Design a protein around this ligand. Structure first.
Ligand SMILES: [Mg+2]
Ligand SMILES: [Mg+2]
Ligand SMILES: [Mg+2]
Ligand SMILES: [Mg+2]
Ligand SMILES: [Mg+2]
Ligand SMILES: [Mg+2]
Ligand SMILES: [Mg+2]
Ligand SMILES: [Mg+2]
Length: 213
DNA sequence: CCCGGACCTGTGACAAATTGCCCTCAGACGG
DNA sequence: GCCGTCTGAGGGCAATTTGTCACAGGTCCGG
């Protein structure tokens, strides 16, 4: 059925800041690259993007165009080593068609210890931080569909590049943790719960348990 | 001892960002 | 060779969500 995304854990655990629209495009690049027999040159069709994510052609065009120009200057850190995503601006040879030049030094980090999920699992998620959380949980999923993992809060803040006010724990709870656990439970086939680990007055880890519906 | 102080929690406000919608009009193609 | 239609590249919108901070209200420490 739907496209099966796979990626090296090094990408799941990398430090970067991307929007929802950019992350959506990134899944197709990883799919194109992996399906190959490099050049790092990928392509996106407006009308295909619209059908995949149930958008109109117009709003697809707006999403691709603005996503594409917001990649400029974005950088990726693997814990460390920093790379730019793109080494040339995007451009459109034909109407409804975009051509992009991914940094060929990124290829081995995409294909290597791996993470996998079908694209239908994530295509209704809205908050990009919630996409990051669902990817990290998939990294620990078992064949049958369950798993349990303890993630450190400081590592969450670094890897997902959360904004500065979420270093105050009550804001972390209200605007990130609760919201992203609610989307996953509402928008994916996963059912997720958690509990907090403490040391003194400080909360240090979050312990996630999940099963499949 | 009661205090001021250094931690922690959650909630009420407001500011800045993102969402799916809507409308226009020229490009690429076929009847 | 023109034209009606299917696209998609632009300009926008109000309704929600996300990002930030002041203040109320708990504990323990040391003086
Ligand atoms: Mg958009
Ligand atoms: Mg402490
Ligand atoms: Mg006593
Ligand atoms: Mg008093
Ligand atoms: Mg706008
Ligand atoms: Mg009261
Ligand atoms: Mg007080
Ligand atoms: Mg309290």
């Amino acid at each position: 059925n739907s496209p099966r995304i796979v990626q090296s854990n090094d990408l799941t655990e990398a430090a970067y800041s991307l929007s929802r629209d950019q992350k959506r495009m990134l899944y197709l690049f990883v799919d194109q690259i992996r399906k190959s027999d490099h050049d790092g040159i990928c392509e996106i069709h407006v009308a295909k993007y619209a059908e995949i994510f149930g958008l109109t052609s117009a709003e697809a065009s707006k999403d691709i165009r603005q996503a594409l120009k917001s990649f400029a200057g974005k950088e990726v850190v693997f814990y460390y080593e920093s790379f730019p995503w793109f080494i040339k601006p995007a451009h459109s040879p034909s109407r409804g068609l975009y051509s992009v030049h991914i940094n060929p030094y990124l290829i081995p980090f995409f294909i290597g210890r791996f993470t996998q999920f079908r694209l239908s699992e994530t295509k209704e998620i809205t908050n990009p931080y919630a996409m990051r959380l669902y990817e990290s949980l998939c990294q620990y999923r078992k064949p049958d569909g369950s798993g349990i993992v303890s993630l450190k809060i400081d590592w969450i803040i670094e890897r997902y590049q959360l904004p500065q006010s979420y270093q105050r724990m009550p804001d972390f709870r209200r605007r990130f943790l609760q919201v992203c656990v609610n989307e996953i439970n509402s928008r994916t086939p996963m059912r997720l719960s958690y509990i907090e680990k403490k040391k003194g007055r400080q909360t240090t880890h979050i312990v996630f348990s999940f099963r499949d519906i």
